[PDB]
């Protein structure tokens, strides 16, 4: 007898993390210089994300695959014929795609009328379980309510979250109280082979504008 | 009032995973113009690895890192003066050590071969896997002791790094023995465990080879 030879791409796979569960990951493919009829297998403490069928080598997704919880792990790979069985390690390599979307920290504040133009009124932070540009975050305001008196254009939101004035207010000639709806969204990555901004769910902050007569 | 500013290195810290828990990690530190009174946190998903003192900023190490879990993560800082809290956003950047040791799927295994099997001719197979990635996951095998420990004995079978247990010599269930159990192990390539190179090694397994008479 000869022992069953492992094919040399059973070293290591590549398997993106949007792979969907129950997906035909891979094959474990071996060759026997006697034809022996070959059973394979996957075992030790990381076999539970992967599914072989032990006569054909079909191997199928059992648990989801995150880069953010193991980016990268070991398995054992089996083939065997009637008298031998040859274990082998594989190396599986997850591929990070936009998977996570800007999730807000806690929102409102009480500024005074007579602040100038360019004061912080407030700060927001957000942040995305991915790294890179995919983790990077963009900060909006998608509505001021009231719209009176150029709402629309007395606030500005920067990169690091600060909201500036971009305007003059009047407690007694605009508005004693502004609401804005703020967005967050990552810069962009990969999810579904398909280019994917992941945006957050919009939060309110309140506003109330202080008369110093 | 101006808010708390926390210093240009708070950004970022790399921290190694072999760092035991209750371990100072690092400090978060803050520096108001107004000269007011600072008090400490940190929030998120992944803070569960932190003990800060809300007054003084001390962090402590709560739950073990591991590269092989999570290599690089975020955590929420904050520093709050009377009047305003600032929050931001640190990533922990994780360093690998040999903290992972060979290790067997079976500690026991157990073979039956021939006496007429020709020299070279392949035993019995073994496999040793370290969680540990790069020179520090690399298996070396040996075999450390031979019973029966005869002259020839030592020199009957030779071990390689594919785990393939190799016939370097002849055998006889009569003229020899009718038994061989051979201790093995397999140790790392080695790498750096609390600041010292370190060559992590697995645990003696017993392999029990039988001779089976062909007369
Ligand atoms: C290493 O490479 C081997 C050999 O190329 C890969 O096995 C082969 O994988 C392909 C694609 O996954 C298999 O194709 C599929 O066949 C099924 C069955 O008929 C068919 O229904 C599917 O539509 C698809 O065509 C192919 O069967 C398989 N080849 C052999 C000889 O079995 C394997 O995926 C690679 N493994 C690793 C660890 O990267
Ligand atoms: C960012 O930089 C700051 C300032 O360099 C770091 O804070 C300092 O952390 C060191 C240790 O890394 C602390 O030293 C220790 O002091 C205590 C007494 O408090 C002593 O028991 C220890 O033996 C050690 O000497 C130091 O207290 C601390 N400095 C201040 C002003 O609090 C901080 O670690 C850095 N943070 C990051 C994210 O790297
Ligand atoms: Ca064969
Ligand atoms: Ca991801
Ligand atoms: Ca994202
Ligand atoms: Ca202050
Ligand atoms: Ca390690
Ligand atoms: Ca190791
Ligand atoms: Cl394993
Ligand atoms: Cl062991
Ligand atoms: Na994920
Ligand atoms: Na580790």
Known sequence: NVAPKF?????????????PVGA???????????????????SGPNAYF????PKTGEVKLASALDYETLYTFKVTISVSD?????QRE?????????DNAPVFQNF?????????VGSVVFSVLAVDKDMGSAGMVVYSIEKVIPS???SEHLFRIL??????????????????????????????????????????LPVFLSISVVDQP
């Open 108 to 116: 409102s504040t009480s500024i005074n009328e007579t602040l100038p």
């Open 50 to 53: 992967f599914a072989v069928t």
């Open 82 to 86: 009637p008298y031998i069985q040859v």
């Open 90 to 98: 594989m190396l599986v390599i997850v591929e990070d795609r936009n």
């Open 24 to 42: 035909q990951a891979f094959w474990l493919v071996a060759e026997d210089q006697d034809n022996d009829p070959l059973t394979y297998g996957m």
């Open 159 to 200: 990169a690091n979250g600060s909201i500036v004035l971009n305007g003059s207010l009047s407690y007694n000639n605009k508005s004693a109280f502004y609401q804005l709806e703020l967005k967050a969204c990552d810069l962009g990555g990969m999810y579904h082979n398909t280019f994917t901004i992941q945006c957050s």
């Open 7 to 19: 094919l040399a791409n059973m070293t290591s796979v590549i398997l993106p993390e949007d792979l």
């Open 148 to 150: 009176t008196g150029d």
